[PDB]
Amino acid sequence: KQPISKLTRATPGSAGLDLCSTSHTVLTPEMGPQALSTGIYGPLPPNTFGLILGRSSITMKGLQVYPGVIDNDYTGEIKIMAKAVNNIVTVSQGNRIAQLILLPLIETDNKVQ
Amino acid sequence: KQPISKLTRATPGSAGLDLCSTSHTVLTPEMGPQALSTGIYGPLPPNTFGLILGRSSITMKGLQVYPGVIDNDYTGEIKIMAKAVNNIVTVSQGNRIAQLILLPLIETDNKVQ
Amino acid sequence: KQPISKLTRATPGSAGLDLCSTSHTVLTPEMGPQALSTGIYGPLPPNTFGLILGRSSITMKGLQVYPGVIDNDYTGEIKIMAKAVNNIVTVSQGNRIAQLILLPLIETDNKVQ
Ligand SMILES: O=c1ccn([C@H]2C[C@H](O)[C@@H](COP(=O)(O)NP(=O)(O)OP(=O)(O)O)O2)c(=O)[nH]1
Ligand SMILES: O=c1ccn([C@H]2C[C@H](O)[C@@H](COP(=O)(O)NP(=O)(O)OP(=O)(O)O)O2)c(=O)[nH]1
Ligand SMILES: O=c1ccn([C@H]2C[C@H](O)[C@@H](COP(=O)(O)NP(=O)(O)OP(=O)(O)O)O2)c(=O)[nH]1
Numbered sequence: 573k574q575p576i577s578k579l580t581r582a583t584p585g586s587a588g589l590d591l592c593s594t595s596h597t598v599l600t601p602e603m604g605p606q607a608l609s610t611g612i613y614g615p616l617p618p619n620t621f622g623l624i625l626g627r628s629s630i631t632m633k634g635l636q637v638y639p640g641v642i643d644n645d646y647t648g649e650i651k652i653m654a655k656a657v658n659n660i661v662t663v664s665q666g667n668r669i670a671q672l673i674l675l676p677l678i679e680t681d682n683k684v685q
Numbered sequence: 686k687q688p689i690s691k692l693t694r695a696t697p698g699s700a701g702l703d704l705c706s707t708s709h710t711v712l713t714p715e716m717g718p719q720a721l722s723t724g725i726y727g728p729l730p731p732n733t734f735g736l737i738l739g740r741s742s743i744t745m746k747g748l749q750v751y752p753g754v755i756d757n758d759y760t761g762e763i764k765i766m767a768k769a770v771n772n773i774v775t776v777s778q779g780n781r782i783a784q785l786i787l788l789p790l791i792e793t794d795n796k797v798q
Numbered sequence: 799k800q801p802i803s804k805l806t807r808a809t810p811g812s813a814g815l816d817l818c819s820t821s822h823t824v825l826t827p828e829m830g831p832q833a834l835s836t837g838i839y840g841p842l843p844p845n846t847f848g849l850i851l852g853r854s855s856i857t858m859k860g861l862q863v864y865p866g867v868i869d870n871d872y873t874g875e876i877k878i879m880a881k882a883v884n885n886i887v888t889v890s891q892g893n894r895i896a897q898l899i900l901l902p903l904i905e906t907d908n909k910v911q
């Protein structure tokens with residue numbers, strides 16, 4: 573169970589923190605959306621939330637990552653929601669397949685149900 | 686016609702403001718993108734804009750929400766752009782199917798056409 | 799080779815900077831993801847990064863843009879990653895098909911591999 577602080581960025585000016593799949597997974601379009609496990613857990617730094625997006629090279633190879641929100645106070649495992657677009661996609665254990673981007677969490681007076 | 690201030694968040698640290706469909710709608714993949722009505726209208730708080738994203742549990746059930754930008758000065762009805770991925774999807778009136786996330790609107794000198 | 803400063807926004811309160819395709823391109827669903835060229839190059843203003851999203855009217859006409867991250871220090875050509883959803887899509891040279899949104903780049907202590 574690793575916290576977000578263990579993630580790395582490709583370059584100093586890279587916006588995304590790369591996420592790996594902890595399992596070897598084969599995906600086909602007929603399977604629809606699948607939740608890939610990353611081994612990384614919330615919560616996030618104060619006053620931030622996360623967006624999970626695909627890496628461009630992975631998108632171009634036919635694996636679509638559906639953008640996901642990581643809440644500031646989420647303490648579960650970060651999953652990547654993904655679907656093979658056209659072809660059979662093979663995700664090997666350790667392949668970096670998505671990235672976490674951190675964004676400011678704006679306060680509002682909206683009610684909390 | 687309800688303003689964004691009427692939306693609610695799941696938990697204090699939830700980044701998204703949940704959006705419902707005001708109509709019962711059936712969707713199939715052959716239909717392609719459909720615009721679902723929410724009953725909620727812009728504009729947004731000063732110096733912010735909005736992103737519309739799917740809820741993860743709804744994405745995993747096979748309804749893809751295409752991410753959308755809500756401009757600061759949009760005064761129309763917020764719609765959710767959605768497509769059934771693989772299967773028939775039935776959206777009941779009142780189902781929360783997407784979420785609005787508020788983000789800072791950065792000023793630049795880019796021209797305004 | 800044009801910098802981001804040359805882009806325009808639809809209205810003063812429009813969050814997105816519109817991106818055009820510099821080539822006439824036909825797309826079908828069987829083709830999967832294709833990278834469209836825009837003629838516009840990073841890098842981005844200090845302390846910002848970019849998200850590339852579809853325009854809503856273009857999404858509703860059946861061209862899906864996969865959201866992409868533009869890093870602060872990217873100096874290559876901004877491309878739009880796109881797929882025809884259901885039908886044949888014809889992108890004419892000069893059609894505005896996506897938009898760049900600028901967001902704050904949050905600093906963290908994550909390591910840089
Ligand atoms: O891609 C994702 C999206 C969400 N998540 C986790 C973290 C986020 O805080 C949590 C809930 O996200 P959403 O609000 O998008 N899902 P939903 O509205 O279905 O669940 P909840 O009712 O708990 O808010 O799911 C992921 O791990 N990966
Ligand atoms: O998912 C969405 C996306 C956009 N919208 C509305 C609000 C946003 O301010 C407005 C215009 O969004 P885009 O700029 O993405 N669309 P487009 O560029 O086609 O229209 P315009 O030329 O008016 O900017 O459409 C939604 O209601 N839901
Ligand atoms: O839609 C996109 C996404 C990315 N890009 C460019 C700019 C961005 O800085 C760069 C790298 O993006 P990602 O980190 O998403 N791709 P990946 O992780 O495959 O490459 P790298 O290993 O270089 O980080 O690709 C685009 O031009 N359009």
Ligand SMILES: [Mg+2]
Pocket residue numbers: 582586588627671
């Ligand atoms: Mg990268």
Ligand SMILES: [Mg+2]
Pocket residue numbers: 695699701740784
């Ligand atoms: Mg939620």
Ligand SMILES: [Mg+2]
Pocket residue numbers: 808812814853897
């Ligand atoms: Mg627009």
